Swiss-Prot record, chains A, B:
Gene Ontology terms describing biological process: cell volume homeostasis; chloride transport; monoatomic ion transmembrane transport; response to mechanical stimulus; signal transduction
Enzymatic reactions: 2 chloride(in) + H(+)(out) = 2 chloride(out) + H(+)(in)
Motif Selectivity filter part_3, chain ranges: 412-416
Gene (name only): CLCN6
Listed result of changing E155A: Abolishes proton transport, but not chloride transport. Strongly increases anion current
Membrane spanning stretches: 36-68, 83-105, 131-149, 155-172, 221-238, 279-308, 315-336, 387-406, 412-436, 478-496
Tissue and organ expression note: Testis, ovary, small intestine, brain and skeletal muscle. Low level expression in aortic and coronary vascular smooth muscle cells, and aortic endothelial cells. Isoform 3 is only detected in kidney.
Organism ancestry: Eukaryota, Metazoa, Chordata, Craniata, Vertebrata
Database matches in InterPro entries: CBS_dom, CBS_dom_sf, Cl-channel/antiporter, Cl-channel_core, Cl_channel-6, ClC
Signal sequence, start to end: none
Effect of Y478C: In CLN15; strongly slowed gating and increased current amplitudes
Record protein name field: H(+)/Cl(-) exchange transporter 6
Membrane-inserted regions that do not cross the membrane: 114-121, 185-197, 201-209, 444-458, 459-461, 462-473, 474-477
Length: 733, 733
């Protein structure tokens, strides 16, 4: 596949300089105030999207579980026990069918949105991730998927749903059109989505700080923190005013909350955790890492099977697959609820199914409750679940969650991984207490650590995940046990495979820049990875050359260079080359006054010109005849160049009949005169640091005599390319 | 004053390349494991330093208040009430005298350490901030200053005390000698100090992320977070095992904890805060900003008075000043305790002085308790303090804290600013309740917001302060009220002046690089700020030229250049210039094979050589005679060059008699061949961004023909220089 990076790096040219001269400090303050308003609006809209999802998910789940429960009672008294299953199947197969049609409409909405937000914040531009139809096909697709009982989550796709809003809202005010601002706003939207999904605004801010790992922008972080705070306190304001009666109160954080981690007042010896518990937490982490590695291995194999045996099929398939998994999931839940469910002697939350009077089914209250409610029941209830029920539930949920992720419907992954771990932690707590007396500590701490050591095993996130979990638990004393079970569960799994998001990004072939380069690649140099063969643009070039290079080549940036070694064209190029060069003595006096040889030729580097800018110049009548001076020019302003920003014209789309060939066009005023440059002797570590942190695109390599010697893009710094070049370097020596 | 920046930027030269070739992946993993161990040790040692301070501060305070309290009782029954004052004066004047002698020993330990940590993390190297004697003169100076009742704090100097440990411990293992690692370790130590002082490891991590605003280091942040977690959970483990009996439990976080913010179970209408409270919080923020601005104005005037009327005096003064302020702040406390104190009918915390039976003195229990205890009493305890007592206490504490900061003793500023705000918040809560009924909300929320809106007024920190306060309160629902009163209390104060740390850094004249440049300076270019006159080093230069440039000039880096336009020296320079250049066709074929004018001259840029490297080469016999080939050379290895890292020899210290002049020395193998470079057309925004984030030093400016036209350092990007050059630019046009 072919992917195109973002134009994050600022291009300062003559129209931008005119706008700069016009602007003053008061206009800057007004623009910054408008930016604050837009950030607040993005946060509020993400909170509202989360509210819309949450309200209707439960409005449908309650209806579906209130139509079957009476059917369960009557068909159980009659002994038929078949009408309820049929009604549940009808509900699930209708909801999943509606959720899969909405993904046939927009295929990018499939799965968790996080793999497509790790890429946009990296600057890769997955072709359809920030348009409104994707938001409609994901928000409406989730509430028909999780309401159909597919063992999926809602807080996963919330990051993508917030990212879409952050991309859309700032665009209406031409000052917000550039990608330099769009990437900042999508980072703010992702932070807001994380905050609204987990109730951890600091966690969302740190999630946005990496995955977009650029220079520390103090002021952008202070805005993406306010966006997350506004997102998590707008969802809270409405969700604590609809469920309860009090409106002004803020009684419950975002969609996934853990609860209150306090021990009973009766036991003074009881503590949340003690120094002895840390040894148990280290083993829980290394077991969770192995379980997450098994999960990732199985899901990677399943995805490899699907990408070759299901995707290359008519659109009728990828709907039958989702219906099949929904039918299997419903039948397994219902059968494991009537049978293998332990009726225990005894609330609105608790569910009584297939059990006698004054008795409840632990498996039924596990499965028929919403996943967020089941997490609370596994955190803060003791003695409700027997160890056999917990083991069977863990096995079934683990297998079905592994088999479900990858199908067309907009699935999530945080909750189904945060809920198997809760079962594992509760099970190990139950077996520990019976085996040897450990009643001096809270029992829900083991469930929390089991959930954390499974998230760390599956998604393998750090910093962001640690802060998200700590802020979700609302207990700072869990700072150390969580972190030391997130850095072990990762270190255990890294031996086997990468995180699931990395797995599902690598299957598509998306070119990503890793967190940092290795030392062996630091042994490599910039000359080895660069591209010597160049497609260049002369200043004062002709229209024929421009259309030829635009049609022939797919590159999006061309260096503007002059030969180091038509008559009007040559004269203008020589004049520009002479005028541009600024000698040291000239600067001091200004201050005081106050074949293959032909193909590869010495070319003095002058700037970079984008394909978009060249096409914009071609569409307009920006050209001067050789007879007249180069001073004559339509001289497009900055607004005129930015009018057509979101979608630029394709060169094949232009008629090209009106354009007179052999007419000179001046690209000097519109090029980027001084982009970042690296010497051929710079090592790959410095090049990678510049490319990643500056967010730049098309880094040129220029030698010590000012001659451009190569070009470098994202495809040159990708991991497999560096591995191949390092292997070739070892082979040469 | 003259300050020298850090050598943060990596220098990759031939000895480094040899070490790189020797090293493999297993050695890299072992080195990373050792780095993890060193980070853990830094965290543990910072926690132990905090424990040492905390234990002895209370051990001295309890003795000092147990010697007077009895004496107060008997001298009050007799009516003398004079012996207790003499005992208190003796204790205070002895402790302050001992605290001021330890600062006469090490003058840098004076005041809060934060202004000296904002500079080192900026890369300015205040001359004595990371040596062991400073740690001894600050840790031991604090426990004799706060124990003497000077209205100072302990949590301020803890950041500097952790920074010193982080600077000292990694140096014993030559791999940790470079400043590239020292700055990382001092950032980790500062994060650990913040965590141990406030119990907010995430707050310390974010405090270290800025003030060192560089490229996003994923892996370094994950280490400075673990360092802070280890620091705050080692202090906790000992402080909850010494005060209590249980050792394994973690019952109390670092030195300054707020408590538990829960409302009484009796009132259901009661909440921590509600939506209508936000209007009151906004006004509390704008009042706290004005109070902080008044504090800053008064303290700046006092400091400007002291720096010209007290500092240029014999060392006998600056001790009499501290004794005078201690004598005043003892008499004021004692008099405001017997008089102006309301004896109210009624615990170990509560303090009774100058009151009849079954009564307590509210002012006396405010003053005679430790500041951390007074904060708790002002937060979670209602009805104890009358509004008159609170107003008088706020006025007295505000004035004496403003007058105390700046004297020689190691004062702090967080607690004395976090404690006036608590009094203001409690006062406004008491006034509001009597004025109109607002019993539907918690009363300690107003105290918390008043403290936050005074910290925001005084120190004017963001992001870091917000997270520190949120994690200290142990309540995530306080995220929004706190943030919206830190962004207002700052926005109100910015109209008047800057924070205490900015003021007290600017008074010394330390060159700092701001968070970002303004748009008006973005109008400016790199040619305007650069330095055209250059002191350069030829490759294969003679000893005489090197000693001349080293003695004549104070610059610490010299460009290695060759003239663009002895016979052996000229021949070697020409050969090097010819061999170094790599043309584009050469790269392709290698892949396929597999007066004023004399002073300012065209010079092709080849690299940068540090003064330290030149002095190291001069000290050894690194030189070859013109008769013999340049290939002959002692060829110092990496370890030999790094043997003398912390303190480099001064050129005047060398005898220079042994060194034979007119012997050629080749500096090519040891220079930095490919540093970061900027074109003269680059604007000041990009130049500042590169300089600040890459942490680099001596950025060279090279034109389009490879000729170096200028040099840029920290002094060129400082705010005053940019303002002057922008004013000149406006004058020219
Ligand atoms: N103007 C250019 N002239 C020659 N080679 C180029 C040019 N631009 C990029 N390359 C090289 O071509 C290869 C990939 O080119 P590609 O068509 O993917 O670039 P692009 O579409 O402009 O970039 P991106 O995918 O990052 O948006 C890389 O090796 C890159 O260094
Ligand atoms: N090698 C050099 N040749 C000429 N000018 C220089 C050189 N190095 C620095 N300068 C300029 O001299 C001025 C200040 O020089 P200074 O003596 O403070 O530098 P330094 O001590 O090497 O740097 P630093 O203070 O950042 O450690 C600045 O304008 C800077 O651009
Ligand atoms: Cl989720
Ligand atoms: Cl997910
Ligand atoms: Cl402090
Ligand atoms: Cl301080
Ligand atoms: Mg492309
Ligand atoms: Mg200097």
């Amino acid at each position: 596949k072919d992917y195109e990076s973002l134009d994050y790096d600022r291009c300062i040219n003559d129209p931008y300089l005119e706008v700069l001269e016009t602007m003053d400090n008061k206009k800057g303050r007004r623009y910054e105030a408008v930016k604050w308003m837009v950030v607040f609006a993005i946060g509020v809209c993400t909170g509202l999207v989360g509210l819309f999802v949450d309200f209707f998910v439960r409005l449908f789940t309650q209806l579906k579980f209130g139509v079957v429960q009476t059917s369960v009672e009557e068909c159980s008294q009659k002994g038929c026990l078949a009408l309820s299953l049929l009604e549940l199947l009808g509900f699930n197969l209708t909801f999943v069918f509606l959720a899969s049609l909405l993904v046939l409409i927009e295929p990018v909405a499939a799965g968790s949105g996080i793999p497509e937000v790790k890429c946009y914040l990296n600057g890769v531009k997955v072709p359809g991730i920030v348009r409104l139809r994707t938001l409609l096909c994901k928000v409406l697709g989730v509430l028909f998927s999780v309401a159909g009982g597919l063992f999926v989550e809602k807080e996963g796709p919330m990051i993508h749903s917030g990212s879409v809003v952050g991309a859309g809202l700032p665009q209406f005010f031409p000052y917000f059109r550039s990608d330099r601002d769009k990437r900042d706003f999508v980072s703010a939207g992702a932070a807001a989505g994380v905050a609204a999904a987990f109730g951890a605004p600091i966690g969302g801010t740190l999630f946005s700080l990496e995955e977009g790992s650029s220079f520390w922008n103090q002021g952008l972080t202070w805005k993406v923190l306010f966006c997350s705070m506004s997102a998590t306190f707008t969802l809270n304001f409405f969700r604590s005013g609809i469920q309860f009666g009090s409106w002004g109160s803020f009684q419950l954080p975002g969609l996934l909350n853990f609860g209150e981690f306090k021990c009973s007042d009766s036991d003074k010896k009881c503590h949340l955790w003690t120094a002895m518990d840390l040894g148990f937490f280290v083993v829980m982490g290394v077991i969770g890492g192995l379980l997450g590695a098994t999960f990732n291995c199985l899901n990677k194999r399943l995805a490899k099977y699907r990408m070759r045996n299901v995707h290359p099929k008519p659109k009728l398939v990828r709907v039958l697959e989702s219906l099949l998994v929904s039918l299997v999931t419903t039948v397994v839940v219902f059968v494991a609820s009537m049978v293998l469910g332990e009726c225990r002697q005894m609330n609105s939350s608790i569910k009584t199914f297939f059990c006698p009077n004054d008795t409840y089914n632990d498996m039924a209250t596990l499965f028929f409750n919403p996943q967020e409610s089941a997490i609370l029941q596994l955190f803060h209830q003791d003695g409700t679940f027997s160890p056999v029920t917990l083991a069977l539930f863990f096995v079934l949920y683990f297998l079905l969650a592994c088999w479900t992720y990858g199908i067309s419907v907009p699935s999530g992954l945080f909750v189904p991984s945060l809920l198997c771990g809760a079962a594992f932690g509760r099970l190990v707590a139950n077996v520990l207490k019976s085996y040897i007396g450990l009643g001096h500590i809270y029992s829900g701490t083991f469930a929390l650590i089991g959930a954390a050591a499974f998230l760390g095993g599956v998604v393998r996130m750090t910093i962001s995940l640690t802060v998200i979990l700590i802020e979700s638990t609302n207990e700072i004393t869990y700072g150390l046990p969580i972190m030391v079970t997130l850095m072990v569960a990762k270190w255990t799994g890294d031996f086997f495979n990468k995180g699931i998001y990395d797995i599902h990004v690598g299957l598509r072939g998306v070119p990503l820049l890793e967190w940092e380069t290795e030392v062996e690649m630091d042994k490599l140099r910039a000359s080895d990875i660069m591209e010597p063969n160049l497609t260049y643009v002369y200043p004062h070039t002709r229209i024929q050359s421009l259309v030829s290079i635009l049609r022939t080549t797919v590159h999006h940036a061309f260096p503007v260079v002059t030969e180091n070694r038509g008559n009007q064209l040559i004269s203008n190029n020589i004049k520009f080359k002479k005028s541009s060069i600024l000698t040291r003595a000239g600067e001091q006096r200004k201050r005081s006054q106050s074949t293959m040889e032909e193909r590869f030729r010495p070319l003095t580097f002058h700037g970079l010109i984008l394909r978009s800018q060249l096409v914009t110049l071609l569409v307009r009548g920006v050209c001067y005849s050789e007879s007249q001076s180069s001073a004559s020019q339509p001289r497009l302003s900055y607004a005129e160049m930015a009018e057509d920003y979101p979608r630029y014209p394709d060169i094949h789309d232009l008629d090209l009949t009106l354009l007179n060939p052999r007419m000179i066009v001046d690209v000097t005023p519109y090029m980027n005169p001084s982009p970042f440059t690296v010497s051929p002797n710079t090592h790959v570590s410095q090049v990678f640091n510049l490319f990643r942190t500056m967010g730049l695109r098309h880094l040129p390599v220029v030698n010590a005599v000012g001659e451009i010697v190569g070009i470098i893009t994202r495809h040159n710094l990708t991991y497999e390319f560096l591995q191949a070049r390092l292997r070739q370097h070892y082979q040469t020596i």
